[PDB]
Amino acid sequence: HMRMEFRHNLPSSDIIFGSGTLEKIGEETKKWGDKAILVTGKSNMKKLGFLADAIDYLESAGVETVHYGEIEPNPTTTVVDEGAEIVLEEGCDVVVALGGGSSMDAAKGIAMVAGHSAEERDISVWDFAPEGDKETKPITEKTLPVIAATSTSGTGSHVTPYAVITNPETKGKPGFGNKHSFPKVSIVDIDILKEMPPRLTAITGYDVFSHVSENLTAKGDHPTADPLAIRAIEYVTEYLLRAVEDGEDIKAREKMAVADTYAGLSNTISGTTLRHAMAHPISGYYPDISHGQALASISVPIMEHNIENGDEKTWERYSRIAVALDASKPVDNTRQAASKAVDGLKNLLRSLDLDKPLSELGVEEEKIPEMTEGAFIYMGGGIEANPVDVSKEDVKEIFRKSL
Amino acid sequence: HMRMEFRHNLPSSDIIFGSGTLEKIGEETKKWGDKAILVTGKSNMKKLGFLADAIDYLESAGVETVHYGEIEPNPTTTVVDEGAEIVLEEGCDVVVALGGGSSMDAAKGIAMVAGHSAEERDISVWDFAPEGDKETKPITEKTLPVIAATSTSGTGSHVTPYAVITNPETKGKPGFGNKHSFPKVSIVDIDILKEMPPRLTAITGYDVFSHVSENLTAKGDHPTADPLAIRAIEYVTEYLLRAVEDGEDIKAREKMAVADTYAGLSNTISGTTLRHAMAHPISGYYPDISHGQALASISVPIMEHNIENGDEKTWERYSRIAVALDASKPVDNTRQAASKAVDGLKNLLRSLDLDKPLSELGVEEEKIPEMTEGAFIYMGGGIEANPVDVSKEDVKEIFRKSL
Ligand SMILES: NC(=O)C1=CN([C@@H]2O[C@H](COP(=O)(O)OP(=O)(O)OC[C@H]3O[C@@H](n4cnc5c(N)ncnc54)[C@H](OP(=O)(O)O)[C@@H]3O)[C@@H](O)[C@H]2O)C=CC1
Ligand SMILES: NC(=O)C1=CN([C@@H]2O[C@H](COP(=O)(O)OP(=O)(O)OC[C@H]3O[C@@H](n4cnc5c(N)ncnc54)[C@H](OP(=O)(O)O)[C@@H]3O)[C@@H](O)[C@H]2O)C=CC1
Ligand SMILES: [Mn+2]
Ligand SMILES: [Mn+2]
């Protein structure tokens, strides 16, 4: 018998779940600071009115608030470092996020830079970012406390330590963070999530599936995440399409919000693999490409590569994924039973209209070697966690099959 | 549609899982203190040799160690308060537990008393213990850090904030604790667990099932614990009997150790209900009665009472339990489908030889009103979490049916 060995690490988590829980953003933030910077996108939270509510709740609680509504999708080092300057100039002592993964990651990055800086600064978020064997700057408890109110059922960033920041100079899009950047309080408000338009619901919904399906097949044992990851796939297949077709289907929104929370906890305990490692340089070199669409456009080839070079333990995991996708009935540990996850995958991608080759997104074949370099330089952890080896030419071939 | 509302709270968790992970008890304890008190039972850890190993690893790591091997099953206030005096007399700054729930709870209690005490003491663990509407003493970060190495696949105490301490004067056996008493590091060593004799494997195995089955049916929504609780029941039904019949079945031991870890995390997020609330005064008034056997001897009547006074949401949960116990195939939300959990329960109790009336344990009918008073005084939280009301006469009747 092969013995089981693993180490489970999950930072303290405090999740407020329900509709209208934005109410609490003020009371909770006060416990951590008296003056907050409110990190958000540029239009939607404002247009929908939740920006005004959050500011009200914060002020009403007694938290003086500086609004930083500059976060564009796929946040950049410049937008994080410039928000940190505002934290240092205004003396903010707590970072509050209201938005999607782009807002919550920019918030964590701002908390890192501002907490480790001198008076005027002297450090950039990129110092914390992996890059080859570059000795990163340690992320310590100096990191400012973070309050995260997610507006999308996609990234699970409200319950992960990670921030994914793009460097426009290098085009790298690495993730980084630890227990000191895990949000102190996480707010999931169904009234905010239900306003996701259909396309946004589909994109972010598939990010949930991408996290848990990679967490399950990551190398090694990780049994504390597996039940959460499995349950998330079951919720995706049962409720994601319901949420896209009817944004006001509250039960479907609640299930995706729980599934997205599962993915955050699961992704903290375990980790993503080749699919995420290759989707990052896509959004890094093509910033107008959504993270979820990049994941979808390369999933089929990647899952086929891991299955063809896999073993019975990995095949058993892909088989459970297929069952959770309603693509099969019995779990088995063969190459054939694992292949049914590819059929269930294609079905999920089709029902969501996410099955597009990279060509239809704007990616060009000339960019392959650069994106491959980007995957290994900035996502080495994901490549290592993948259940099967991949050389630099394996990844180049995968990219071209996805064109 | 009924909206979903819940708050998830889980303290930071650090779990080292494998065989021979007692190796790490020294390195990990050093990160938290230089002089530890080693809290253990009186004979088994010593007889099996793991006491000598732990002391070695601790010394070898540079942690001077004072051994307190006085913990008897169902720890008492006196044994916790006397261990705290040794912590204060010797100047220990970290509490290390090597044993079952009785050792790990006594360790948490020692950490509480010693951390909040003056020079000589002036406070007892009972000050922290619930007792009617008695204003308990707040448990704060003053609590000494705790390192927990479990020796049994039963209580999940290595990943819970709780300590269950008996007061011999009152006979109460309440549980108490919070984030400040959650072990900093948790070590699960298969080489220690596999030495559990058959009866101990059966008793502690059923405590795992008792936690998760009550966590699932606790009142309100708690979806972050449910997948872990379900997966634990599946592991119990598939592997617990294998572990009892062959203590050296390593895969069965690993599954019960994971299932026991599931139960700890689940019991932290959710909570136990009537079964635990009534099993405590049993061990409180009859200290030689094992916690797990007390749970088993009252389960059938309690589960029948909750099912008869339940609703469709509660019935659906008991139905999922029945499916996980191999007692049924389809999940449904009816009284009939829920009743199949009782059949699967009786099957589990029979295969483990735990189906004994309270009479065969030594309980006497004259003790009913006292045990009922004990349930409400010291386990009010569990009664409140139960999915259906229970009056004081409901609990008296339940006790007599279990005789
Ligand atoms: N663990 C982690 O840290 C993870 C991080 N990520 C990263 O996090 C980011 C996630 O991006 P994602 O969160 O998917 O979407 P983004 O947050 O990047 O942007 C979402 C877009 O949809 C709009 N929007 C957001 N919420 C709503 C709503 N409730 N109703 C209407 N419109 C809305 C926003 O408007 P506005 O412009 O006003 O915001 C924005 O234009 C990506 O960069 C991804 O790489 C991905 C997975 C995990
Ligand atoms: N979350 C919590 O805090 C929970 C707490 N509990 C409480 O925790 C306690 C749990 O008691 P439990 O842990 O079930 O058993 P105990 O730890 O109370 O005692 C176990 C008995 O078995 C022996 N033993 C323990 N491990 C081994 C082994 N590996 N090989 C051989 N013999 C062994 C011990 O010997 P020695 O005498 O040498 O130790 C002792 O006699 C109970 O008091 C229960 O009420 C229950 C559920 C949850
Ligand atoms: Mn993602
Ligand atoms: Mn118990």
The enclosing domain of A34 has a CATH number of: 3.40.50.1970
- Which residue, chain included where needed, has tokens 């169902």? B74
Place of tokens 């990049």: A294
Tokens of B235: 């592991």
* Nearest-angstrom CA–CA distance, B291 and B378: 16
Specify whether B29 is located in the same domain as B2.
Answer: yes
Cross-strand pairs, A16: A187, B7
For B287, the domain range is 198-403
A279: amino acid identity, one letter: A
Interface check A16 vs B, CB under 8 A: yes
Task: Report the number of distinct structural domains present in chain B.
Answer: 2
3-state helix, strand, coil in chain A (%, to 5): 55, 10, 35
Distance separating alpha carbons of residues A190 and A251, to the nearest angstrom:
10
In terms of domains, do B110 and B253 share one? no
Q: What is the rounded distance in angstroms from the CA atom of residue A173 to the CA atom of residue A131?
A: 10
- The answer to whether B305 and B388 have CB atoms below 8 angstroms apart is yes
B175-176 and B163-164 beta bridge pairing: antiparallel
Give the atom of ligand 2 at the shortest distance from the alpha carbon of B152. 26
Angstrom distances, CA of residue B102 to CA of A152, A348, B152, B162, B163? 44, 49, 10, 11, 9
Nominal resolution in Å? Answer: 2.3
Eight-class DSSP state of A68: E
Whole-number Cα distances in Å, B119 to B79, B87, B161, B197, B373: 19, 11, 26, 42, 36
Sequence-distant (6+) residues with CB within 8 A of B136 are B127, B128, B129, B130, B176
Under a CB-based contact definition with an 8 Å cutoff, are residues B262 and B226 in contact? no
* B227 reaches A (C-beta below 8 A): yes
Query: Which residue in A8, A31, A222, A320 has the most chain B C-beta atoms within 10 A of its own C-beta, making it the best mutation to test that interface?
Result: A8
Locate the ligand 1 atom nearest the alpha carbon of residue A108 and give its number.
Answer: 3
Question: What is the C-alpha to C-alpha distance for residues B333 and B314, in angstroms, rounded to an integer?
Answer: 8
Q: What is the number of other CB atoms lying within 10 angstroms of the CB of residue B132?
A: 10
Q: Are residues A249 and A186 in the same domain?
A: no
Integer Cα distance of A387 and A318 in angstroms: 11
Residues B262, B190 share a domain: no
Same domain? For A53 and A78 the reply is: yes
Cα–Cα distance for residue pair B294/B303, rounded to 1 Å: 14
- Are B165 and B236 members of one domain? no
Rounded Cα gap, residues B285 and B343, in angstroms: 30
Structure tokens at B268: 């932290």
Phi, psi of A341 (to 5 degrees): -65, -30
Chain B residues lying within 8 Å of A180, measured CB to CB: none
Give the DSSP H or E segment for A234: helix A226-235
Q: Would you state the torsion angle of the CA atoms of residues A241, A246, A252, A257, taken in this order, to the nearest 10 degrees?
A: 90
Burial status of residue A376 (CB atoms within 10 A of its CB: 0-12, 13-18, 19 or more): middle
User: What DSSP state is assigned to residue A137?
Assistant: P
Residue nearest ligand 2's atom 39 by CA:
B41
> In whole angstroms, how far apart are CA A210 and each of A230, A263, A294?
12, 9, 11
The CA distance from A210 to A177, in Å, is 20
Residue B32 near residue A26, CB atoms below 8 Å: no
Rounded distance, CA A32 to CA A107, Å? 15
Q: Is B266 annotated as a binding residue?
A: no
Residue B80 · residue B125 · CB < 8 Å? yes
DSSP state of A4: P
Q: Please, what is the end-to-end C-alpha distance for chain B in angstroms?
A: 43
Tokens of B383: 């009664």
Longest CA–CA separation in chain B, Å = 61
Tokens 């709870």 belong to residue: B105
Residue A335: CA count within 13 A, CB half-sphere? 8
- Compute chain A's Rg from CA coordinates: 20
Inter-axis angle of helices B101-116 and B77-90, nearest 10: 50
Closest approach of chain A CAs to the CA of B248, in angstroms? 11
Asked which of B197, B214, B249 is the last residue of a domain, the reply is: B197
Q: Assess whether B145 and B212 both reside in one domain.
A: no
Q: Answer left, alpha or beta for residue B56, where phi above 0 means left and psi between -120 and 50 means alpha.
A: alpha
Residues B333 and B190 placed together within one structural domain of the fold: no
Phi, psi of B293 (to 5 degrees): -65, -35
DSSP-H helix ranges across A24-135: 25-30, 44-48, 50-61, 77-90, 101-116
- Do strands B6-10 and A13-18 pair parallel, antiparallel, or not at all (unpaired)? antiparallel
Quote the tokens at residue A223.
């049994």
Same domain, B177 and B278: no
Question: Could you tell me the two tokens for A70?
Answer: 């500059």
Cα separation of A159 and A120, whole Å?
30
E strand or H helix that includes residue B315: helix B312-324
**Sheet order of strands, A94-99 included:** A64-68, A35-40, A94-99, A146-150, A185-189, A13-18, B6-10
Q: Which two tokens stand for residue A75?
A: 């946040």
Residues recorded for chain B: 403
Q: Nearest Cβ partner of A7 from B4, B9, B17?
A: B17
What Å distances lie between residue B269 and A280, B10, B178, B205, B264, CA to CA? 34, 6, 11, 20, 9
CB count in 10 Å sphere of residue A329:
8
Q: Looking at the CA of residue A173, tell me the nearest atom of ligand 1.
A: 45
Nearest 10 degrees: Cα torsion A132, A137, A138, A144: -130
Q: Which of A272, A276, A280 lies closest to A219, judged by CA?
A: A272
Burial class (CB in 10 A: 0-12, 13-18, 19+), A395: buried
Residue matched to tokens 């088993």: B296
CB-ligand 1 contact for A117 (6 Å cutoff): no
Ligand 2 site, CB within 6 A: B 41-45, 73-74, 99-103, 105, 151-152, 154-157, 160, 162-164, 192-193, 195-197, 200, 204, 207, 267, 291
Say yes or no: B203 and B193 in one domain.
Answer: no
* DSSP class of B386: S
| Neighbouring C-beta atoms of residue B323, cutoff 10 Å | 20
* Backbone phi, psi, residue B360, to 5°: -75, -10
Examine the domain organization and report whether B242 and B376 are in the same domain: yes
Pick the last residue of a domain from A197, A227, A243.
Answer: A197
Q: Cα separation of B87 and B145, whole Å? A: 12
Minimum CA–CA partner of A7 in chain B = B16
CA distances, A31 to each of A24, A58, A237, B120, B179 (Å)? 11, 12, 38, 34, 16
Tell how far CA A358 is from the center of its chain: 20
Interchain CB contacts (distance < 8 Å): A and B: 98
- A163-164 and A175-176 beta bridge pairing: antiparallel
Dist CA B389 CA A204 (whole Å): 41
Domain co-membership, B180 together with B221: no
Domain end position, chosen among B197, B219, B248 = B197
Distances (CA, A) of B351 to B164, B235, B355: 28, 15, 9
C-alpha torsion sign, points B51, B54, B57, B62: negative
- Chain center to CA of B30: 27
Cβ(A378)–Cβ(A173) under 8 Å? Answer: yes
User: From the CB of residue A288, how many other CB atoms can be counted at a distance below 10 Å?
Assistant: 10
Token digits of residue B190: 């298969």
Write down how long chain A is: 403
By CB neighbour count within 10 A (0-12 exposed, 13-18 middle, 19+ buried), where does A219 fall?
middle
Residue B170 is encoded by which pair of tokens? 């009152």
DSSP A239-272: IIHHHHH-TT-HHHHHHHHHHHHHHHHHHHHS--
HSE, CB side, 13 Å, CA atoms: give it for residue A356. 16
Q: Which residues contact B12 (CB under 8 A, 6 or more apart)?
A: A10, A11, A12, A179, B182, B184
Q: How far apart are CA B8 and CA B222, in angstroms?
A: 7
Experimental technique used to determine this entry: X-ray
Within 10 Å of residue B359's Cβ, how many Cβ atoms?
Answer: 12
Q: Which helix (H) or strand (E) holds A348?
A: helix A335-351
Residues B232, A223: Cα–Cα separation, whole Å:
11
A225: left (phi over 0), alpha (psi -120 to 50) or beta: alpha
SS3 A363: coil
Task: Quote the CA–CA distance of A386 and A381 in Å, as a whole number.
Answer: 9
Judge whether A12 is closer than 8 Å to chain B, CB to CB. Answer: yes
DSSP state of B131: B
Orientation of helix B312-324 relative to helix B335-351, angle to 10°: 40
- Residue type at B358 in one-letter notation: L
Is A14 in Cβ contact with B6 (below 8 Å)?
no
